[PDB]
Amino acid sequence: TRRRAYLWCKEFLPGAWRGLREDEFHISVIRGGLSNMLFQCSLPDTTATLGDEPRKVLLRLYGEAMVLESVMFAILAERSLGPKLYGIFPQGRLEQFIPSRRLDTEELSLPDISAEIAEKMATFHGMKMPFNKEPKWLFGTMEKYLKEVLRIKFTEESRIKKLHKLLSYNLPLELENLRSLLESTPSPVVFCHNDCQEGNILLLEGRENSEKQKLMLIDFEYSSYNYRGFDIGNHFCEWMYDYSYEKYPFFRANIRKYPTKKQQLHFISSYLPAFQNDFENLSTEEKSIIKEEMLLEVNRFALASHFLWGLWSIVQAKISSIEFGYMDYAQARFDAYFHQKRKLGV
Amino acid sequence: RRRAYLWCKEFLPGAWRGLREDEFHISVIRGGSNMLFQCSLPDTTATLGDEPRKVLLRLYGAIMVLESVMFAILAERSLGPKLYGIFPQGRLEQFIPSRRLDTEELSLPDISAEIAEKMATFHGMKMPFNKEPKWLFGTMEKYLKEVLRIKFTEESRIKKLHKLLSYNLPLELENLRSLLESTPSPVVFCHNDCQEGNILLLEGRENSEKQKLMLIDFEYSSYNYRGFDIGNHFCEWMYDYSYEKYPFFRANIRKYPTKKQQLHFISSYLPAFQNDFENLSTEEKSIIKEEMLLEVNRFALASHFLWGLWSIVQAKISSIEFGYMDYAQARFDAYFHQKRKLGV
């Protein structure tokens, strides 16, 4: 693996990289795993660059999808909305290394942080991409996962019991009820991230005192044309889930951590002028009509966030070997789904 | 045909998204592996915003990530047709009102000067692809391997191949290896197929001296020796692929650029490619040029060899009505003629 990494960096990267020896190669693990492993690759600090080649890069090893992912990543790189792309090959890619950390769950609620996520998401949403513009993604995905879910058979008792509790809700009928609520909820179709969680938002080192330009959104692998309401509602759902809990089930869920109407309004108040550059010049009461209906829009689409990820999580409980309480997480999402219906009175 | 309506309806914005099937228009441009079409809105329909009134559909036919990433990158940089949609069966691209150049137009001073400048621009780009120049001989070794094992059923083809194999193609490749390894040439991002048929003359730009053309169809592109891209383009001055009768090409060795015409090309290329060249002395400029002439005339030998070999393989597998074996023989004849000229 060291040898393979060396060879990619040597052949894809220009300048000092082109004549680097194996023994001069510096690599270390950024992330392990069975898929999307990450490595930091660098020049000896004693090595001069010959030009504007990077001193350090990120290697991503994978471990239509591939074609679309790659075209998407390249376009974002060209537009300065994602890491630059230095090299692409069957088994992975080389990207810009961005010194940074990810946001913690508790930081999503900080006013400056949420204001900037809103601005960044709005920008993302206004971009033109060469992808199918028809919003079949949301329900096509849920239908895909539901089919799988109804075929699952566990052998171990605890998983058997957890599954039968979830199935007892009549998921097919419940998905038809959700389709109906969303049928009557107008929402623009935009280019959505679909996974805007803290773990996919970088706090960029050097600018943690910058007020409006300290973040970058990454990991656009679930991205697609989709209802705007899904992206924002999904993001609001993620204020409640903390994935860094060190004991089983490896997440904490807190329903009271969902943004208040006042926190929701602060977010959409940054989103709207960013998406519609003239918005601020509208009559104050058209502004209020817009905001109130959008609030209803995103809180209805938040239900699809629960439903989609709950179903996904049940499929993972069968096919993934990652250490995570997938069945416990699906139940957390379905608990939130029903609570949010009771909140909305639906 | 409803497939095409659906892709345009689904991938294209504005007035395209609410389009009914009975208002959709599609015309052919090239039948057959890369079938070309021309889809458009009704002349009565008004645009809601940006959307193109007309687009080009490309079908991958019989056969992806690299070519698609390349095409997307060139679109973003304004160096290729825009990319409007991408799917497993093809892509929708911007439609550029233009025509291709004719072979004879390659030698016109203003045309030649611009191609040189465009190629220099292509040559300076950074692309996320392998920078080792393994393409040239890797490709030639690959086609040679296929050539040594193919069997024709037709007697004419069997005899044409026999004459070609009689040159001792493996030994001649090693002869070309020693020549080229002794010939320095910088590695750059090469088009690799810069012929008249891949150069657009843009509509309404005919009077522009310096900006009337666009380079297209970068499917063979890779990091490769700069000498190849230039020597290859010089060879293309000799081949006219629009001839109306079998073998569907004309070859003319006398149409290879004179020294004068070659210097005219490189004198436009060089200032456009290396930033410091314009400010060099007359005498350092002439030194670079003379060495560049030796460089590219030598690499032109690889253009005849590679495409001769390629053309033998195509004779086996291609459906296209084209005299592939005769073209292969035309390329090997020019190969040997150019060696005699150069004294190598």
Swiss-Prot record, chain A:
<keyword id="KW-0225">Disease variant</keyword>
<dbReference type="GO" id="GO:0006656">
    <property type="term" value="P:phosphatidylcholine biosynthetic process"/>
</dbReference>
<keyword id="KW-1208">Phospholipid metabolism</keyword>
<keyword id="KW-0887">Epilepsy</keyword>
<dbReference type="GO" id="GO:0042149">
    <property type="term" value="P:cellular response to glucose starvation"/>
</dbReference>
<feature type="binding site">
    <location>
        <position position="219"/>
    </location>
    <ligand>
        <name>ATP</name>
    </ligand>
</feature>
<dbReference type="GO" id="GO:0006869">
    <property type="term" value="P:lipid transport"/>
</dbReference>
<keyword id="KW-0808">Transferase</keyword>
<feature type="binding site">
    <location>
        <begin position="96"/>
        <end position="102"/>
    </location>
    <ligand>
        <name>ATP</name>
    </ligand>
</feature>
<dbReference type="GO" id="GO:0004305">
    <property type="term" value="F:ethanolamine kinase activity"/>
</dbReference>
<dbReference type="GO" id="GO:0004103">
    <property type="term" value="F:choline kinase activity"/>
</dbReference>
<comment type="pathway">
    <text>Phospholipid metabolism; phosphatidylethanolamine biosynthesis; phosphatidylethanolamine from ethanolamine: step 1/3.</text>
</comment>
<feature type="binding site">
    <location>
        <begin position="33"/>
        <end position="35"/>
    </location>
    <ligand>
        <name>phosphocholine</name>
    </ligand>
</feature>
<dbReference type="GO" id="GO:0004104">
    <property type="term" value="F:cholinesterase activity"/>
</dbReference>
<dbReference type="GO" id="GO:0005737">
    <property type="term" value="C:cytoplasm"/>
</dbReference>
<dbReference type="GO" id="GO:0005829">
    <property type="term" value="C:cytosol"/>
</dbReference>
<dbReference type="GO" id="GO:0005811">
    <property type="term" value="C:lipid droplet"/>
</dbReference>
<dbReference type="GO" id="GO:0042803">
    <property type="term" value="F:protein homodimerization activity"/>
</dbReference>
<keyword id="KW-0597">Phosphoprotein</keyword>
<keyword id="KW-0551">Lipid droplet</keyword>
<feature type="modified residue" description="N6-acetyllysine">
    <location>
        <position position="136"/>
    </location>
</feature>
<dbReference type="GO" id="GO:0006646">
    <property type="term" value="P:phosphatidylethanolamine biosynthetic process"/>
</dbReference>
<comment type="function">
    <text>Plays a key role in phospholipid biosynthesis by catalyzing the phosphorylation of free choline to phosphocholine, the first step in phosphatidylcholine biosynthesis. Also phosphorylates ethanolamine, thereby contributing to phosphatidylethanolamine biosynthesis. Has higher activity with choline. May contribute to tumor cell growth.</text>
</comment>
<keyword id="KW-0594">Phospholipid biosynthesis</keyword>
<feature type="modified residue" description="Phosphoserine">
    <location>
        <position position="168"/>
    </location>
</feature>
<comment type="subunit">
    <text>(Microbial infection) Interacts with PI4KA/PI4KIIIalpha; CHKA bridges PI4KA/PI4KIIIalpha and hepatitis C virus (HCV) non-structural protein 5A (NS5A) and potentiates NS5A-stimulated PI4KA activity, which then facilitates the targeting of the ternary complex to the ER for viral replication.</text>
</comment>
<feature type="binding site">
    <location>
        <begin position="31"/>
        <end position="37"/>
    </location>
    <ligand>
        <name>ATP</name>
    </ligand>
</feature>
<feature type="binding site">
    <location>
        <position position="60"/>
    </location>
    <ligand>
        <name>ATP</name>
    </ligand>
</feature>
<keyword id="KW-0991">Intellectual disability</keyword>
<comment type="pathway">
    <text>Phospholipid metabolism; phosphatidylcholine biosynthesis; phosphocholine from choline: step 1/1.</text>
</comment>
<comment type="similarity">
    <text>Belongs to the choline/ethanolamine kinase family.</text>
</comment>
<keyword id="KW-0963">Cytoplasm</keyword>
<keyword id="KW-0007">Acetylation</keyword>
<feature type="binding site">
    <location>
        <position position="197"/>
    </location>
    <ligand>
        <name>ATP</name>
    </ligand>
</feature>
<comment type="subunit">
    <text>Homodimer. Heterodimer with CHKB.</text>
</comment>
<keyword id="KW-0547">Nucleotide-binding</keyword>
<dbReference type="GO" id="GO:0004713">
    <property type="term" value="F:protein tyrosine kinase activity"/>
</dbReference>
<keyword id="KW-0444">Lipid biosynthesis</keyword>
<dbReference type="GO" id="GO:0006629">
    <property type="term" value="P:lipid metabolic process"/>
</dbReference>
<dbReference type="GO" id="GO:1905691">
    <property type="term" value="P:lipid droplet disassembly"/>
</dbReference>
<keyword id="KW-0829">Tyrosine-protein kinase</keyword>
<dbReference type="GO" id="GO:0005524">
    <property type="term" value="F:ATP binding"/>
</dbReference>
